[PDB]
Amino acid sequence: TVQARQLLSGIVQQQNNLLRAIEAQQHLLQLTVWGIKQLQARI
Amino acid sequence: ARQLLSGIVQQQNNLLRAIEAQQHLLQLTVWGIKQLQARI
Amino acid sequence: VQARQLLSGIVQQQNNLLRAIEAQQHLLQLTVWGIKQLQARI
Amino acid sequence: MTWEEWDKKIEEYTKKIEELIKKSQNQQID
Amino acid sequence: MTWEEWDKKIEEYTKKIEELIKKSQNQQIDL
Amino acid sequence: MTWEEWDKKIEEYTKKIEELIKKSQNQQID
Numbered sequence: 001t002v003q004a005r006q007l008l009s010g011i012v013q014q015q016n017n018l019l020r021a022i023e024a025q026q027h028l029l030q031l032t033v034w035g036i037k038q039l040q041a042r043i
Numbered sequence: 044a045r046q047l048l049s050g051i052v053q054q055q056n057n058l059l060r061a062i063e064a065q066q067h068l069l070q071l072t073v074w075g076i077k078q079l080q081a082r083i
Numbered sequence: 084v085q086a087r088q089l090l091s092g093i094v095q096q097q098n099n100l101l102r103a104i105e106a107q108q109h110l111l112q113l114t115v116w117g118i119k120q121l122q123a124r125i
Numbered sequence: 126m127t128w129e130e131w132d133k134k135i136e137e138y139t140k141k142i143e144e145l146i147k148k149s150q151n152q153q154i155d
Numbered sequence: 156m157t158w159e160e161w162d163k164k165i166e167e168y169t170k171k172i173e174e175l176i177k178k179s180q181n182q183q184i185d186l
Numbered sequence: 187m188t189w190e191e192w193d194k195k196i197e198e199y200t201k202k203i204e205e206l207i208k209k210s211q212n213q214q215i216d
Contacts, residue, residue, distance in 0.1 A: 014184065032073065064141045071134055072111065108142055113195060
């Protein structure tokens with residue numbers, strides 16, 4: 001089939017989309033870990 | 044075939060919705076950090 | 084076509100994606116503790 | 126956004142994720 | 156690092172997540 | 187909990203999130 005070759009193409013493609021949002025949320029999390037350590041070092 | 048790809052697709056929606064709600068949590072933590080940073 | 088060792092890999096990749104979300108959720112529960120403890124001292 | 130709402134949205138978005146994890150764990154076992 | 160750059164990195168990644176979540180919405184196959 | 191333990195759990199969860207992402211990338215290239 002040509003449809004089953006494109007459904008897997010779209011499934012694999014969005015498995016990449018879910019992967020890179022988790023990567024981009026980790027960068028944001030590490031900045032929150034940094035902003036807490038810097039603000040804690042003040043008090 | 045259409046029972047696993049129905050489940051695999053369903054998981055992509057379940058993993059996506061957990062990312063969106065986790066982004067809502069991240070925006071609130073960024074909020075709290077900036078409200079405390081702007082006070083020091 | 085012979086998507087056997089392709090689907091069975093998507094499933095395992097969807098598992099580690101789930102575990103990375105569960106570990107970030109723990110990490111986020113560690114950050115909220117810090118902001119509510121930094122707020123308690125203000 | 127507000128502090129007294131911050132503590133409300135944190136607790137409700139925390140539970141939204143935990144249910145979605147429970148839902149993702151169940152869908153995973155297959 | 157600097158708080159100046161922290162404001163520039165927090166806002167840069169939040170836009171990248173939103174674009175990445177926006178595409179995941181335009182690429183979620185709700186069969 | 188103390189910040190000395192807070193730091194311990196942060197660099198323990200972070201090192202495994204990076205490890206899980208390491209696995210997810212090696213599985214993404216298929």
